[PDB]
Amino acid sequence: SGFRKMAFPSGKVEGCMVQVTCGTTTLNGLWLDDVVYCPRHVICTSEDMLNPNYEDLLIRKSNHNFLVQAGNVQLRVIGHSMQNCVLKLKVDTANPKTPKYKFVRIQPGQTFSVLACYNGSPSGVYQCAMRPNFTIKGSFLNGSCGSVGFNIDYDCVSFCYMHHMELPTGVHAGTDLEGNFYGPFVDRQTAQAAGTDTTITVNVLAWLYAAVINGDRWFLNRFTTTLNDFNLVAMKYNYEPLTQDHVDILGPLSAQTGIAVLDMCASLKELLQNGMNGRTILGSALLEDEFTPFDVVRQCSGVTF
Amino acid sequence: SGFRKMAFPSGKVEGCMVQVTCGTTTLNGLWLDDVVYCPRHVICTSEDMLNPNYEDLLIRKSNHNFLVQAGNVQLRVIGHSMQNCVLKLKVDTANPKTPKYKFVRIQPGQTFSVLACYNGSPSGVYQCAMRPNFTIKGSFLNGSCGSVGFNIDYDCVSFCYMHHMELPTGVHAGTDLEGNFYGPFVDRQTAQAAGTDTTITVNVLAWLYAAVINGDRWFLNRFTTTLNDFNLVAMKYNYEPLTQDHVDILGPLSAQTGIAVLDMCASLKELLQNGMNGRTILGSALLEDEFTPFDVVRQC
Ligand SMILES: O=C(Nc1cncc2ccc(F)cc12)[C@@H]1CCOc2ccc(Cl)cc21
């Protein structure tokens, strides 16, 4: 029993964290095989971050300008190239700790673990979700850039995020491992604002199934609804639309608990229009939306890595 | 900026997780140097559930009765001894991945990361607090016994917990790495009940300072309180008494934010009286008590 926000074991990723220093800037890099990936803004100065020409700044750099440090060992940079907002530094040594990995771009609502690093050293691991507005509500201080988000499928690490910046509201923005930003963000010091966020509906429903699996049933009602009636209520409360794909994905949880997806939707619909009434679900007074249907199944089944 | 429940990176601990099988029972072990630590209840049969005599059951065991598996490699057990509720299995191979480590017994309110394992394989990592009633509100299924709680402060892993059992309310009980249980619990299937839990007051206050550091000030007030008056109010909301030690520990956060501890205590009194009023503090509609003053400073 019990339900916790649980991250993937970070060991396979810790063996890849390195420190990348370019001039006065020091951030983290991801060392996979003979390549070190890091945010391209590591080559920026104070004037350069205001309006940057990264092709021009990178052309002025040489391999010895990048100081890469894996533990207490300096790696020699033998090449540098840029892929979108990520800098790739070819090194002379392949990382012996390179796990089986893939680079995957995730969709809003999907969750992943973040290994927060400072100076190439892992300091914390937390779980989070790609918000519908493409930000992550992370926990990052100065020096955390280059920290990565990942999932684990069997023995394979899927890298899905690299930290680039913090927005004025304290939320975070970054890219996939190909340097493509999540959201309408650019890697420059300029006025940027995250759009109004919405609740990840399929995730709230999965967390309601997790609560039922853990013995919390007070919110269940005799009612069911249509996907049409439910999405009208969802739009009204700044909740993401629930598609037939989401209903299908929630199928195994619906079968395991005996509560049809549209029946759980009628519970959510009532919870939105009426509230908790001083009650809690899984020790929370708010509806949790950072557990996907797969996270719930994985935690309430005991899948290992 | 931002505030999250954050666990320590679990890599140093993953390299120590092994599977321990004794007869039909399979749980997890912690392999440090040439010793594998695991709950002593791994030697229990269906008959040894209510009243096991562990000294008697262990004496009937031989080294070849314990099957230890590190990855896909079976380790050879060359000795077995018991220290309180933990079984120690001497193996013929020192773990090459053994980190710098210590065994530390923690106090209620203290937080730690849990590496949840099944069959010697790490499946998840989460942050926990030792509740005032000496239980942990974990997330554990059958087979998770032997999963450990730890802190990784500067290079060294401090092991503070080993999972042993789940109580009837779904809360969890375990021991330090010397086999001494946290709480009035025994490793028997006998009727055991966790005492009524209370909120870790010093931790709520630390989390309120984290909220102020992150720009949340709506809950602050112009009031201060005496420590005794705060405690008389707090105890009525099932909160732990705040001692002078707690007030002293909150000192650096008080200095950093310019809000005196007893002034933050008056804001906490008001929050217990009024509730949130639809508002949230650090994205939470409840007062969070699983961040210690040391966690808040570390994260901020
Ligand atoms: O606590 C136990 N099991 C489990 C532990 N942690 C989560 C569990 C979750 C589910 C589950 F089925 C078993 C779980 C076992 C078996 C029940 O009785 C006792 C009594 C004393 C001792 Cl030391 C251990 C146990």
SS (H, E, C) A144-206: CCCCEEEEEECCEEEEEEEEEEECCCCCEEEECCCCCECCCCCCCCCCCCCCCCCECHHHHHH
For residue B264, give the 3-state DSSP assignment: helix
CATH ID of B198-300, from 3.20.80.10, 1.10.1840.10, 1.10.10.350, 1.10.443.10: 1.10.1840.10
Interchain contact A11–B (C-beta under 8 A):
yes
Q: Are B85 and B160 in contact (CB under 8 A)?
A: no
CA distance B111 to B126: 11
Q: Report the distance separating Cα A280 and Cα A21, nearest Å.
A: 47
* Exposed / middle / buried, residue B38 (Cβ in 10 Å: 0-12, 13-18, 19+): buried
Residue nearest to atom 20 of ligand 1 (CA): B189
Nearest to B10 by CA among B133, B131, B159: B159
Tell which residue, A106, A118, A157, A163, has the closest CA to residue A19.
A118
Nearest-angstrom CA–CA distance, B108 and A278: 27
CATH number of A15-99: 2.40.10.10
Q: Do domains A1-14+100-197 and A15-99 have the same CATH topology?
A: yes
Residue A119, chain B, CB below 8 Å: the answer is no
What positions of B carry a catalytic annotation? 41, 145
- Per CATH, is A1-14+100-197 categorized as 3.90.1300.10? no
Q: How many Å lie between the centroid of ligand 1 and the Cα of residue A44? A: 55
Phi, psi of A153 (to 5 degrees): -115, 105
- Mutation pick from B3, B8, B10 vs chain A, by most beta carbons of A within 10 Å, is B10
| Domain boundaries defined on chain A | 1-14+100-197, 15-99, 198-301
Q: What is the DSSP letter of B4?
A: -
Up-side HSE of residue A52: CA atoms within 13 Å toward CB?
20
Nearest to B71 by CA among B49, B93, B88, B86: B93
Q: How many whole angstroms separate alpha carbon A200 and alpha carbon A270? A: 17
Q: How far apart are CA B22 and CA B20, in angstroms?
A: 7
In chain B, which among 165-194 make CB contacts under 8 A with chain A? 166, 170-172
Q: Does B19 touch chain A (CB under 8 A)?
A: no
- B187 Cβ closer than 6 Å to some ligand 1 atom: yes
User: What does the alpha-carbon distance between residue B141 and residue A6 come to, in Å, rounded to a whole number?
Assistant: 14
Nearest CA in chain A to B165: A1
Give a three-class secondary structure readout of chain A: CCCCCCECCCHHHHCCEEEEEECCEEEEEEEECCEEEEEHHHHCCHHHHHCCCHHHHHHCCCHHHEEEEECCEEECEEEEEEECCEEEEEECCCCCCCCEEEECCCCCCCEEEEEEEECCEEEEEEEEECCCCCCECCCCCCCCCCCEEEEEECCEEEEEEEEEEECCCCCEEEECCCCCECCCCCCCCCCCCCCCCCECHHHHHHHHHHHHHCCCCCCCCCCCCCHHHHHHHHHHCCECCCCHHHHHHCHHHHHHHCCCHHHHHHHHHHHHHHCCCCCCECCECCCCCCCCHHHHHHHCCCCCC
- Name the phi and psi angles at B69, rounded to 5: -125, 115
Taking each continuous run of H as one helix and of E as one strand, the counts in chain B are 8, 13
Q: How far is the CA of B73 from the centre of ligand 1 (A)?
A: 27
CA distance to B74, B133, B234, B291, per residue, from B238 (Å): 49, 12, 7, 18
Q: How many angstroms separate the CA atoms of B182 and B106, rounded? A: 9
B1 touches chain A (CB under 8 A): yes
| Cα three-residue angle A267-A207-B10, rounded to 5 degrees | 170
* CB of residue B40 inside a 6 A radius of ligand 1: no
- Euclidean distance between CA atoms A194 and A171, whole angstroms: 8
Residue from B42, B163, B166, B189 whose mutation best tests the ligand 1 pocket (most atoms within 8 A of CB): B166
Which residue's alpha carbon is at the smallest distance from atom 16 of ligand 1?
B165
Count of Cβ atoms closer than 10 Å to residue B275 Cβ:
14
Tell me which chain A residue has its CA closest to the CA of residue B275: A278
Beta strands B156-166 and B100-103 are: parallel
Measured in Å, how far apart are chain B's first and last C-alpha atoms?
7
For chain A, state the CA radius of gyration: 21
Residues in chain A within 8 Å Cβ distance of B284:
286
Find the helix packing angle between B201-213 and B261-274, rounded to 10°.
Answer: 100
Catalytic residue among A22, A41, A44, A80: A41
Options 3.20.20.70, 3.80.10.10, 3.40.50.2020, 1.10.1840.10; CATH of A198-301? 1.10.1840.10
